[PDB]
Symmetry: D3
Subunit: 274 residues, 6 copies
């Protein structure tokens, strides 16, 4: 039996024997959390959720899990869980390239609170384009969507009757909104919390253009730097699925062949370590 984790912003589902049960923990990131911390979260909110017995080898995929901060997780993951084999963890980005591309080779994009892209060559990401973040890049993410949204609403750049609703729907006030992007933690996550307002107002010819465009640019500024002219692109992540209809629409008008598009990669990510 193997244990598999795919994590990041917000929660972190925890799904198998030889080909059994999922658990609902939180998101683990070693770029905000430390090691003398995650030994508690796994022992407190996970240990009583496990089916007991000795494990084999877990493969941790998730936020901040880099080839540089990887051991931060493996040094704690091992000091908390009952395993005899060994623990492995790869770039959160790889969690997609193994679940969307499995054993083959191709592009893989994770569009969540951040939009990142890779070139999976059947072995690993043979080249990456650091999205740069919800400010300089990340073009086409909840972060960048919440940003742009409030950016046009708190500026009367949209129907005056849509701002009154947005302001009351989130109960936020203009000053708080601004104080929540320049003076507080996880702005990328905050702005992103105002993402659904877009999927709830797609009738507005404007809001839809606020989503389409975002993805247009992402395609022409974040993925086109590969040999897409001869390869299919797959997707993963909230905003990616939630706007599936809208997303691929741009892919069409951008001479690129969109492929597999689903919220979580854990599906075929099970069929990778078995």
């Amino acid at each position: 039996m193997i244990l598999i984790a795919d994590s990041g912003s917000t929660k972190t589902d925890w799904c198998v024997l030889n080909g059994i049960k999922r658990l609902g923990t939180k998101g683990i990131n070693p770029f905000f959390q430390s090691e003398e911390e995650i030994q508690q979260k796994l022992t407190a909110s996970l240990l009583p959720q496990l089916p007991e017995g000795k494990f084999n080898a877990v493969y941790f995929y998730g936020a901040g899990c880099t080839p540089e901060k990887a051991p931060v997780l493996r040094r704690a993951i091992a000091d908390s869980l009952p395993v005899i084999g060994n623990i492995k963890a790869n770039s959160d980005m790889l969690a997609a390239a193994h679940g969307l591309c499995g054993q083959k080779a191709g592009i893989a994009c994770i569009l969540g609170t951040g939009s990142n892209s890779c070139f999976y060559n059947g072995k690993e990401i043979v080249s990456n384009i650091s999205p740069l973040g919800f400010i300089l890049g990340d073009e086409g993410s909840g972060a960048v969507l919440g940003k742009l949204l409030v950016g046009d609403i708190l500026k009367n750049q949209l129907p005056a009757t849509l701002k009154e609703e947005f302001l009351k729907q989130f109960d936020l006030t203009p000053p708080e909104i601004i104080d929540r992007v320049y003076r507080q933690p996880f702005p990328n996550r905050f702005l992103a919390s105002l993402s659904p307002f877009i999927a709830q107002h797609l009738e507005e010819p404007a809001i839809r253009q606020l989503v389409m465009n975002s993805f247009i640019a992402f395609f022409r500024r974040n993925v086109m730097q590969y040999d897409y002219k001869q390869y299919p692109v797959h997707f993963i992540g909230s905003i990616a699925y939630c706007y599936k209809e809208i997303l691929q629409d741009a892919a069409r008008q951008t001479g690129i062949q969109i492929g597999k598009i689903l919220q979580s990669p854990m599906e075929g990510l099970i069929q990778y370590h078995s």
Copy 2:
């Protein structure tokens, strides 16, 4: 006093009866960041127009300016937007705007600021500023949406590595005041049809989201700022396809600000 500020350089000019007698220049003052007993320390080391010195944070300067400086008149500490509304509009109505490290616009009837748009900041809005230009410059260049050598010369110019540019906009202090020190790289490459279009669009946007709100079909929109002067050519060039009459566009607002208190001194 009469002093104009802008986090970087604050030009002072003590008036006497018609013109400056002797001017100095102490680094930018800002209560939104600086401490009273730290400006009361700095200054010791009247009309005041500073950045981020809103009418709620005004009394922070008026105290530090008194303790350090000997003056028995009437102490005033207003915004940096009001300084432009005074120098660019004088006494007549106008659409005061500034394009510093952060763009801004307001409506000065002729006595005070009545209707002032709310530029969010270097992240949410500030379209058409000194920091936003960098936010777009250090972005497109670092996003391979530009030549291969232009990127090598760039980073070889500021001696900055990509993994440190990131550590300078999110992690370290002042991301907009950092994206401004990269702004110059633009004015020095207005040859490329791209880098120039990275400014035009960021200027068409400023209008299509700020000035175009006030009654512009009757009032003259006057600009001011270190980026407003540095990019004066493309400036009105942008006011070409938006349809609007651009007026007084001077770099420093101190000029017309002296013409405000030139009545009683």
Copy 3:
């Protein structure tokens, strides 16, 4: 069914259907706590205490709940609880004016770790007198009582045989006592923790004068700024009830008509939202 909360220093009782069960959480204050925090406390130490099912509309009364920091609670209270209607929260001070004055109009004073006073005009507090705090004001509170107490004991201003008992009863040492008022958090709460020593030594002709006086001044320096000459005053809060006999005594010799006096307002606070 409505949910009602009255909170502040120390715990926070949580009591009804159409006119059902109380819960024992802790005190929530958005002037020391943040929003990305209270979503946990309500989900952790409250959720498993609820009777399940969808609620209607809760009315949060408590510490730091101001018309300025109010949404801090309503933005988290909503993101944690299972409600469909809407959440409401008013000044902790109002929690008294609605439970002691109900629908009528009159004065209302909360004497707890802090002494605050209002003028309820049947609609809301039509005028307030910021007590200023356990240092400049708050005259007549546990904070101000603990202060004054230790102030006279740690100065040999009281029976030398009463100081030895106080020092050992709290196991505190003079230096700790001083280090707990100038260099640590919630001094108003600490000094206030030494309040009971007064209700346990009321035989002492001195200690009682240490309580009476405190309330005398409060009446003549914190409430008399209203039209008390034609209105009845009610009370609420620990020190208010615990010293009920002593309190109203001053009210007598201060030409004012004391009225309803009870520890918590939740009683008739139920009969306000039903």
Copy 4:
């Protein structure tokens, strides 16, 4: 070294053989707040009598004073209460007391401090100090227990808003050193029968809780401090209804402190 301190102004006076040759004045030093390698930095930028320089924190100054200053004699760093016990009592017994930003009292037999009362602080005790006067002044005034215009003139004098006065005693640093900069408002309004009674009572209390403990029916109680001199009239006026003989009451203790080391120099 000979130097007297008091967080605000520390008057220095290098002795030679009978009197001061040249004096200076560097801001107040206090290890209880300041860092050794920060006084060792400051000073570089012997008998020492400072505030909050208890015999446990004494070696903090003696090191910083040596590293910065060239002196091969005997380095001493004592309290600020001992400076008054020396200047006000000299060599003869006495009841040394100080009324700075924080009142204090002690008993100096004639060689050292034997019995020293423990003034708690500006919150717990310090009755009859420079900070407590403010603690009562910024309180009664802000508590409407005084005229309506007296409150308007007050806040119009220090340019402080009520919601900021709060943010200055609880939230921001040094609440007692802040309630002292408001102390002056009292000496400038001793006309009102109230403001004057806000001092008297705060002075009757000092005695009824500090000096009246030591054997006062035989020893002279000598005062000193910026508030002790500023309110000298009401001072002994309070020593009128308490029944006690008030002695040497000088503002600066440096005078009689030189008369202490005037033996060997």
Copy 5:
């Protein structure tokens, strides 16, 4: 019935009626933790582990429990536990002198993450030698053992094939190891976490000399400052027991008579308060 605690680094076992059950909490130290904290740990992770009913008098032995920080524990220990008698706590060092020397007099050394020594005179430690810490002193502890170990391994001062194993066994990398001793909390505890590597490689003629020596110096630099020439020495603590065979070996070649040596003192520490 009395409650007894012996604590320090890592966990803290909690064992009796008149001469009943142990509990497994964590380590409480008032030199890193505060009082407005331990009231939670005892109420959260201990209260549901107790056999209920009113207690008599607990005797807290453990980290940071000094005659100066003692009340930090007794002020919280009392405000959390259901006791009517009184609480007592002595130097963690004394926890050994009462369990190894009981009522008699003699030396007592605690060799754990830190090596401390005392002279128990039947009444109390009549003289102490502050070990000074895992840097200037503590000679002969896990701290000092982990230190010395990594000190010779990360310097190729040992078999090159033993370093590759150490580095992979702890999954640590040289830079992390250094960043974990100069820039992070509880280094004494970290370095000490690499202690077992020594008890797992005692075959190496070198590693054993890395342990023997450590204890040799400890004897000749930390305990010999007493009248050992006429008194027996007892031990307590992890590294003390784990290397029992190796330890006393030095005692032999150091003209000193080693005596009782066992991991925890709680054994006879029960037979002290009964």
Copy 6:
């Protein structure tokens, strides 16, 4: 440039064509501790060789040195170990080593550093340094492994109490730079057969754990540092029982460093 650093004193020497024209001396610079806009502030208040200025932290100085200093040549900022490898080895191969507040060793082929041992730090390794000597000095003395009066004179010399020495190596900043300011107590007591053996062993160890690794049976090991010169006698005395040829042993590396850039200036 040419400047050598070492957290304490950084000696500057502006070269012209063959020798120093005028030298200064500003406190030690170190990005590993100091902030760019804090060195850009400091300096304003080329070849650079500093402490803890690894090739990863090099661009931190090269920017601050440019903003503050006017220079249009080629800006370099290298380690402090490379400065010794250049001054002690010049152009010919050698075993560069330093014995400052932290010992170090490396192998300079004749163009750069190829094989550099990794001295851990003042706690893990650094055997044979300025801080480690204190780590052993403030330890054995405070461990009664030395005379009774030697301990009294010691603490009476630095005016430090045992319970504060602890608060200076674990709790307070810079434990190795603190254990260096105690280093001098050794050179002033090389009479005792013990204190001298506390250095020898700490020097035999340096060799038996650092230099003895490189091919020492053919290359000359050159030293440098404030502790390397202060203890020059015992130095080579230790190189007596370890069997190794000690070469250029100069206190400051600036001498031979000028002989490096004396080619083009």
